[PDB]
Structure 1
């Protein structure tokens, strides 16, 4: 019996920032007066693009006030143009409490869509930039022993350029920026750049701008108190191809960009995905800890090497990572296994939900029971699992995968 997934309209994107659809404005080897202050970086990144144009709504949010989203983006540009005229650039920028910002800051069964699998495939790929330093993974106080060191360097080589790792660092940056603003600027609608940092294949340091968030008032007394925010993220993805993915967004067309491509130079429209959203102190603390995804994934690999090692009365680290008893690798390479485990850990973090917690525990129970019947040859457990298959894309996709592990 395969699990029954729900019927209904396709599920929609619900992460805190864009994943496969993001777009970066970037500055190489940055060195302007104030390199390392988010606002200065963001402006220098904005100054690298000359294709801006009069923005308009191309995919409206069906349940919000689309003129207010438009006005909020035009306000961001207008207030950044103001900083261009102030002699000293300030360290932070508090937006005017306009009617559009006050409104935007607050002052059902869904079937499985194909985009979430595509998102997961993209998260497993390699980018052309590295996102972590060589000794990033780990917290140890002492120098690490020789075997642990070898394992960490092999694993880091495989995941440092991984797209899942860019999501980790992107998520760590924005969650740190927002939580700091949440208490350093409680009464302000602070403009908060979405920044990441990477090193190219030639060693060049690069600073990237994905867009902006504007936080609401944040008098966060406890871990569960909510700070609302508005996110505005560049993208080359035309939202009119998969409109169901963007149910929660108003999408603007805000410029045109010249690109290298397989057909040579091409001009493509640039979009801005805008939605309102919220987070809590506890969720931002968790978002600051996303580098533990790297550690949790490494430890799953170290578990497999420990198994093979205690079987051969010998350390199997070199033999595992160099692919030397097994005569292949199902995913295709050891690198893909590392990046698939990483991607699972990152998406569990980016798409955390009670639905995910139930399905994770309850489907493990159904698995062990099925494995014990397959090697050696329930209606209430099946219900506890399917009570978590409601509308969450990550959970629905993991259930789709579970059915495949059932048919085999």
Structure 2
């Protein structure tokens, strides 16, 4: 048949028929009869379309506007688009069924059909199926035709199409084909995939067919019981009832006095910070001008060119650090509007950037025997330090300066909005003036500046002031300069790529008072000042530190601590409001007629626990969140995640739920492996041990 189609039909018609069959998911090879039928229909449709054109007057003529537009043979989407456009242009109802031709002379859709039987029967069948919307014309190989309109075609066209049909029928009869003229998805597997399948079966199956049959037929009816009976008894959860005696202090090594005191490793001074204050009208100015004016106010500190070294950590060069600090001062105090360092070559070595290993191609390193992989740097095991407790005590106290300023919101028209506003007012009033809020504001501002310079500057050394905006009770606004930083180079795009930052921070705390807290800081005594008529020294803590893009990005997001500190209290307040109807915020914080103000066990002194107001608990929670941010690293995350289990076990013990632990030493070791050198983790372990002892005493009674 294929030869017949190739001989009797053009390549274009065959291609269109094959495409049409593909649209219907019918294989042309397996249904040659339908292929021939579609080819004949398409050829006759073109025959009617051809040899007809419209003149400028719109009258049919023989030749440019063809008198007919062919819709059969086009893709279903294109055919539907052209049919819809033709209907819309001429204001004709769009026929439901796809037409085969369109006549512009009458502006009517025409359907072309071919049948072996009487033309009238097929004409009536098609009219019933479609109706009178579309003009009907049906041709038959017996030289009989049925046309809805007799003026659509002239004698020549009908004669030509009938002659072509007669020739096709005669040729089919000659080849004895006219009488002869009367699956789904097959996802076959290849040779490679089948071979991989055969060798990916469990032990005991030679090929995938064996596994298929075994899973399809064999039914297990107690294989689990047989295996459990056959399995050794040495494997088991080995559970043990948990008791207060089972619980023991976590990380006893922190009480060893041979280990070094854990040092201060925060990016910026938190409780020892000193901020040079310059009162301002309130206008916002660039950090460089802020630093310049603040230093101008304190001329003695700015003009101090002679350093009095108090202590150099282990390797920090006093000359390098002091020269870098003087370069920062000169750059900030210069007339130029750029905070760029004016040396850019001394700073290459002062910051330690120039002491970087040189990369070489692999072959030399492979040949060079002396090149070896470096041993990992284990974190030192330290013991508890009192400075962490002192910082916790100090950061949760109220100060005279509030640095947290938030945008306004729309007016409140609903009671819910009013209660929310009241709770927000109480929360902010409690936490506005706490020192942790000022420290958090300083941290976020510094990190935002660091990131802005990181993306703005790549291969240069920038001076970044450590600045803050602080408003006191009277409403006066101050710009506070806490020091300066050298942000050097970067030259590295991505998430984890160190950017050297050399921080010089003002302070008023003598490093000799607590020597073990500052083994990383090179501090000079740069001057003195009279805060309230009393002389007080001013040291300059200098340190070299590293940071990444993610670190600065999350430093900008240290304000969410505020949210974390409110959610908690909200819930607490909410719970009280559940106990008794009326709003409990005022009663919880200050007390009312029928409720004493709420109090929480905050700490202890001389071995006796101490209670504090709800506001003190708020400040403590906020400080805890801020310290979680500041001392956040892998160690803190691991310690918190692993100690949550112990906290939940202790809670179950308190409620007399009879907790059971399948193994306790494993949990304890997992918790303790994260207590290496993070000050917050060690202090939290100490606090956990103290609270666990208190809970044991309370349980005894």
What's the CA shift for 1:338?
A: 1.1
What corresponds to 1:170 in structure 2? 442
Deviations 1:29-84 (A, max 9, x none): 247xx851100010100011133332131111213222211221222233345x1x
Alpha-carbon distance in 2 for matches of 1:101, 1:61? 20
1:98 paired residue number = 345
- 2:483 aligned residue (207, 211, 223): 211
Deviation digits for residues 63-120 of structure 1, max 9, x if unmatched?
3222211221222233345x1xx3xx41533442133553424231111110011111
Which residue does the alignment assign to 1:407? 693
**Alignment correspondent of 2:676:** 390
Q: Cα offset for 1:145?
A: 2.3
CA 1:317 to 1:269, structure 2 compared with 1: closer, same or farther past 3 Å? Answer: closer
SS of the residue corresponding to residue 279 of structure 1 reads coil
Partners of 2:559 and 2:342 in 1: CA distance = 31
2:536 aligns to what? 268
Counterpart of 1:391 in 2: which secondary structure?
coil
CA distance in 2, matches of 1:327, 1:178: 44
Partner of 2:326: 74
Aligned-pair Cα RMSD in Å? 2.2
Corresponding residue of 1:353: 633
Of the structure 1 ranges 158-167 and 309-318, higher mean CA displacement relative to structure 2 is found in: 309-318
- Contact 2:309 2:524 (C-alpha < 8 Å) held by counterparts: yes
Query: Pairwise mapping of residues 4-403 of structure 1 onto structure 2 (< 5 A)?
Result: 4-6=252-254, 7=256, 8-30=259-281, 36-52=285-301, 53=304, 54-81=306-333, 83=334, 86=335, 89-107=336-354, 108-133=380-405, 135=407, 145-260=417-532, 265-324=533-592, 328-330=598-600, 331=602, 332-376=612-656, 378-403=664-689
- Between the aligned partners of 1:323 and 1:398, the Cα distance in structure 2 is 32
How far residue 128 of structure 1 moved from its aligned partner, in angstroms, is 0.5
Contact 2:331 2:463 in 1 (8 A): no
Deviates further, 64-73 or 381-390: 64-73
CA contact (8 A) 1:105 1:216 kept: no
Which SS does the other structure have where 1:226 is aligned?
coil
2: CA distance, partners of 1:333 / 1:320: 9
CA distance, structure 2, for counterparts of residue 326 and residue 106 of structure 1: 61
Judge conservation of contact 1:56–1:70 (CA < 8 Å) in 2.
no
Most deviating of 319-328 and 374-383: 319-328
Q: 1:259 to 1:150 in 2, by over 3 A?
A: closer
CA distance in 1, matches of 2:349, 2:315: 17
Aligned residue pairs total 394
Larger Rg: 2
Cα distance in 2 for partners of 1:154, 1:135 equals: 17
From the superposition, tell whether residues 105 and 288 of structure 1 become closer, same or farther in structure 2 (CA, over 3 Å). farther
Question: Offset of 1:328 from its aligned partner?
Answer: 4.4
Secondary structure of 2:307's aligned partner: strand
Q: Could you say what secondary structure the match of 1:55 adopts?
A: coil
Structure 1 CA distance, aligned partners of 2:382 and 2:407? 42
Kindly state the Cα deviation for residue 269 of structure 1 after the two structures are TM-superposed.
2.1
What's 2:215 paired with?
none
Normalised by the size of structure 2, how large is the TM-score? 0.54
Q: CA deviation at 1:218?
A: 1.9
| Stretch deviating more after TM superposition (100-109 or 63-72) | 100-109
Which SS does the other structure have where 1:116 is aligned? helix
Q: 1:46 to 1:211 in 2, by over 3 A?
A: same
**Match of 2:323, SS?**
helix
User: 2:321·2:350 contact (CA, 8 Å) conserved in 1?
Assistant: no
Distance 2:680 2:348 in 1: 31
Seen in structure 2, the aligned counterparts of structure 1 residues 373 and 80 have a Cα distance that, compared at 3 Å, is closer
